[PDB]
Amino acid sequence: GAQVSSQKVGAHEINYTTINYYRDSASNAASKDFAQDPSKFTEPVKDMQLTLGNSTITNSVVAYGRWPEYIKDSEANPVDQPTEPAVAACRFYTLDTVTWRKESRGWWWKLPDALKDMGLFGQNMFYHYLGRAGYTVHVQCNASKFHQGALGVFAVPEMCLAGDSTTHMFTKYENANPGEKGGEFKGSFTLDTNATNPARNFCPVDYLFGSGVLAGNAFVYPHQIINLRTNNCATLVLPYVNSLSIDSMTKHNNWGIAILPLAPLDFATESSTEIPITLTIAPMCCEFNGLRNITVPRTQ
Amino acid sequence: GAQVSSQKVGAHEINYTTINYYRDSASNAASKDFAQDPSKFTEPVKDMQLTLGNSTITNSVVAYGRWPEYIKDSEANPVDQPTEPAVAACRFYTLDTVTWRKESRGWWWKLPDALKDMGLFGQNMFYHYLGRAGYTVHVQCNASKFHQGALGVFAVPEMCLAGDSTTHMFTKYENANPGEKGGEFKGSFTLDTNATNPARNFCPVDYLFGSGVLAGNAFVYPHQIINLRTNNCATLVLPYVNSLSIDSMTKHNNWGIAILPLAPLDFATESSTEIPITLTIAPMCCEFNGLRNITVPRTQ
Amino acid sequence: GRAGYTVHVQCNASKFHQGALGVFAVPEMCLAGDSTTHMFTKYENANPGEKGGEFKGSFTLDTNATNPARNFCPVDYLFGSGVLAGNAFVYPHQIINLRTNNCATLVLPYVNSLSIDSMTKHNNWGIAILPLAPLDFATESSTEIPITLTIAPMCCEFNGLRNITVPRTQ
Amino acid sequence: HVIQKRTRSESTVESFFARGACVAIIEVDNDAPTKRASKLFSIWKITYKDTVQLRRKLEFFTYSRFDMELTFVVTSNYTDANNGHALNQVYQIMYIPPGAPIPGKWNDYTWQTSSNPSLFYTYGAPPARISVPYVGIANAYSHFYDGFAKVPLAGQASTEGDSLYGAASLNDFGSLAVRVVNDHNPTKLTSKIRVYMKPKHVRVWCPRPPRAVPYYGPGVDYKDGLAPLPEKGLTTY
Amino acid sequence: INDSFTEGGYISMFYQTRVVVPLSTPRKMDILGFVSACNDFSVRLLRDTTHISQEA
Numbered sequence A, B: 001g002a003q004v005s006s007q008k009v010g011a012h013e014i015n016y017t018t019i020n021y022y023r024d025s026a027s028n029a030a031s032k033d034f035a036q037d038p039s040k041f042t043e044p045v046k047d048m049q050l051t052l053g054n055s056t057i058t059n060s061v062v063a064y065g066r067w068p069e070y071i072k073d074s075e076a077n078p079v080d081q082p083t084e085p086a087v088a089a090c091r092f093y094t095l096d097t098v099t100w101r102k103e104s105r106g107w108w109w110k111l112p113d114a115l116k117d118m119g120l121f122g123q124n125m126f127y128h129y130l131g132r133a134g135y136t137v138h139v140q141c142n143a144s145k146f147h148q149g150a151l152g153v154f155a156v157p158e159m160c161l162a163g164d165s166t167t168h169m170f171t172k173y174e175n176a177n178p179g180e181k182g183g184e185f186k187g188s189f190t191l192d193t194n195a196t197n198p199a200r201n202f203c204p205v206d207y208l209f210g211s212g213v214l215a216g217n218a219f220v221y222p223h224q225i226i227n228l229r230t231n232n233c234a235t236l237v238l239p240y241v242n243s244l245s246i247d248s249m250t251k252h253n254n255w256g257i258a259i260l261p262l263a264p265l266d267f268a269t270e271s272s273t274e275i276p277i278t279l280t281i282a283p284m285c286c287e288f289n290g291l292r293n294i295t296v297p298r299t300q
Numbered sequence C: 001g002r003a004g005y006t007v008h009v010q011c012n013a014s015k016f017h018q019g020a021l022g023v024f025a026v027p028e029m030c031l032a033g034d035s036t037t038h039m040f041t042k043y044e045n046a047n048p049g050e051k052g053g054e055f056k057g058s059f060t061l062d063t064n065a066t067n068p069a070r071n072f073c074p075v076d077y078l079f080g081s082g083v084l085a086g087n088a089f090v091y092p093h094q095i096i097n098l099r100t101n102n103c104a105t106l107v108l109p110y111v112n113s114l115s116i117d118s119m120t121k122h123n124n125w126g127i128a129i130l131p132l133a134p135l136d137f138a139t140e141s142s143t144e145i146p147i148t149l150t151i152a153p154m155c156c157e158f159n160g161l162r163n164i165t166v167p168r169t170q
Numbered sequence D: 001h002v003i004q005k006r007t008r009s010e011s012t013v014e015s016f017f018a019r020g021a022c023v024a025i026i027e028v029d030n031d032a033p034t035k036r037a038s039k040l041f042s043i044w045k046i047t048y049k050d051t052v053q054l055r056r057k058l059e060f061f062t063y064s065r066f067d068m069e070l071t072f073v074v075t076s077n078y079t080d081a082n083n084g085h086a087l088n089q090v091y092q093i094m095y096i097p098p099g100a101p102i103p104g105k106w107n108d109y110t111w112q113t114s115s116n117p118s119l120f121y122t123y124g125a126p127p128a129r130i131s132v133p134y135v136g137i138a139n140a141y142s143h144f145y146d147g148f149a150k151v152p153l154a155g156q157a158s159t160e161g162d163s164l165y166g167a168a169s170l171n172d173f174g175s176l177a178v179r180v181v182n183d184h185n186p187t188k189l190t191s192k193i194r195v196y197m198k199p200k201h202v203r204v205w206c207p208r209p210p211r212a213v214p215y216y217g218p219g220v221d222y223k224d225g226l227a228p229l230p231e232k233g234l235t236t237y
Numbered sequence E: 001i002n003d004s005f006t007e008g009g010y011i012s013m014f015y016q017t018r019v020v021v022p023l024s025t026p027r028k029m030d031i032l033g034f035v036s037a038c039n040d041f042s043v044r045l046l047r048d049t050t051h052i053s054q055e056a
């Protein structure tokens, strides 16, 4: 059972044979213009009015070109019946509005963490052992034609943020899951030296994107730019991304949302100018498994 | 003469060849819901009135799902004609009744040892060099609807019991073959320190099942439970089990019967309560070889 | 909100116990009050939750005009609504006779003048358990056996999602 | 509905025993025979009961039938710094089936091995290896034997007819004799041959509950570790 | 092993009703528990066990 493959000859003066000797395939040797070869990695658009449940919204990227979907029967690990709340949980929830000033270094949120106290979605999340959902994130920021500024919105799978102490991986659960308030990036790294009552919080540096990588490369993640001269809003459609078909929503945050001011806010000649940014997130294709008594995580 | 087999590929970036170089196959490399995959290892039932010879009995397991059978001509080691007593030996013999109290730790017997003095079966056993037989073991224990208690009956092939001394394998033949009286399990291990006149007897600890294994796992052996609220009796059909098609019945005991109180006996409010347990064993498909003068083993 | 139910009443006792329970599922089970004021039972007392309430052997009038209890006074032989208890068998029902059976299962469809209503305002069904034959045992005058209710809502469907309702309590 | 594509390939009895388990550490010496503290040859009664792990795995079942792959890992060292050095050693491993003459000296006639299978191993080479078929005189190997090799008969004295309980010639596979073939260097060398045993082409019968207390001897005896289980509350998760 | 990230959950037993016996009957009784695997059960990565050890 010999495999006769062809070689690619370079310097000329053409087939090579390979035979597998082991039953386990892990023992085998390795076999080896503007158009984007990886069209799915260049933030493909949905190519209006988005209605989910009883919520309606009137610049849309699909992360990795993959729309949210339910678990295939071929890839279902759990065996118990899945709860699908449907319109009850799959609807747009509006988080607390943040304020963009000339001095803002950026904001961040975690999903599903930011929606843990959002109507029936939070109830289903805390009542079940396993949960899964994609998202539609709508960032809203409007300003006059005389305002200038640009925001970069990034959806990062496994958005791990650096700590603030010499102790590695020391950020406690409460500070890593702030909820809908989220957190803010910082312009510099400040080390927490309070060995008695350590803050045990993140210290996400903006130009390091909070994880030791240059912010300029954050555009490799699914992203959208809100340039105030052009558009008001940004829509990101995030499919469920994980190494598992379904996981624990309380333990693990599948996505992170980062908003960084790429161009600082400015207006006329008023040094005092602030415009709100409003996030509206709708979970999509929710499904839960493992119903039992409700989880009540520790707070503060 | 190459063998081209298929691999099961895991991590993908599929056949492997094997050739035997030696004449001896021992030189070869290895080639590699409620429904029970091993139906025969989960104590299958006979799915009334059992009549054998002139004996009749009015919850039946077939050990390993294998009914007793005669030696196939394909698997006959001895060449002399086999003696098959038939109804003369294949009949139900009733052993001495034991007493189950609140303090009993259990009872044990060996087969064919327990039937060595039973009518013509014992005569045939002691007159022949080789003997073979399966068994039907009927344990009988009846009590009122106001009694509570459970007995586990286990048929163990090669039921070797631990000794009582620092000397290994020191139990003498007389103590290892008590006959129809059998022996009793103990609640604790007591070391025999009489170096002058050692008892040379077993010390079977009940929770160790007398062989250094946890009693809870004894259910892997063929077994039946007599739960006093449910059933009176237990029937175990044991085929001949051995590494040989036929062996010496005087040297080797093919089966062991163990009765352990899984739930202690109790009744109303009488702390003094005892109920008999009666064993009735019928050898099945008996066949003997090598007739000569009768064996008379040493006693006491 | 809308839903049917499966109600499983469980009560087990020895073969030497005697007693019978009548389990009745009553649509629009309205219970009489305890005052001269008509229809004066307040929302909190009319919706006790899983603890429910108990029938009484006699009607006691609430005369506390200052702090009225505003509670039901369901008389057992009047079935709590001015009807003779013997006729309660016209409602869907099941008898747990201790000599015969341990439990009772009642499958209740959604019953109402509307296809769907407010679950907080309106109770579609009422469950009544009355001792038809008193409990007794051997010669112990002190004997008690538990009764356990297990209810599964069925074919649930809800409409009109908004912020959560938080009804007043106590 | 879930598509359940999980296999039990690694839990087959073949995969369960598809490993090389160490059953013996045989110690031999290369030294002047005038020295009395040095053992110039070693005899090991072949068995799997000198160690516990493979024994416990095998005793999950009552009967077994398999071929056996033996691998030999040989290590050596100087026992002294002075007295010079040594040249590469050659080891003879002679299989002595029951009945064959047993060497009494490291250099007697038995090492001619005219009929006994012998394995010559050169130090520094990859570990030696050989295969053996199923060589039981019965139709399967008996991991347990509830009987005796002798039946004491009425009349004969208590000394006669006595045999160890559970001991039979079903497990009499002979021994391994090991020696260094080189003549002694002016310096003493100590070597250890580790024997790794792999059952292959395996079949098993009559599963048993595994050993729960420390093994005590070649039988089923137990003496010391008779409280294997820890304390845990009845209603403590 | 005991691992928080792959913990399996909890099992418990409760009285739904109580246990009822008549007179002249034992008021205390025993229950036994058994555990087995279903036919969809599999294991991976054979390893040495901690339930057996050999001193010396």
Ligand SMILES: CCCCCCCCCCCCC/C=C/[C@H](O)[C@H](N)CO
Binding pocket: D046, D047, D048, D064, D068, D070, D093, D094, D095, D117, D118, D119, D130, D132, D135, D141, D142, D143, D171, D173, D176
């Ligand atoms: C040629 C010299 C190297 C040594 C050759 C060794 C050959 C003799 C080894 C075969 C004897 C062992 C056969 C297998 C027996 C097992 O230990 C047990 N009976 C398994 O139950």
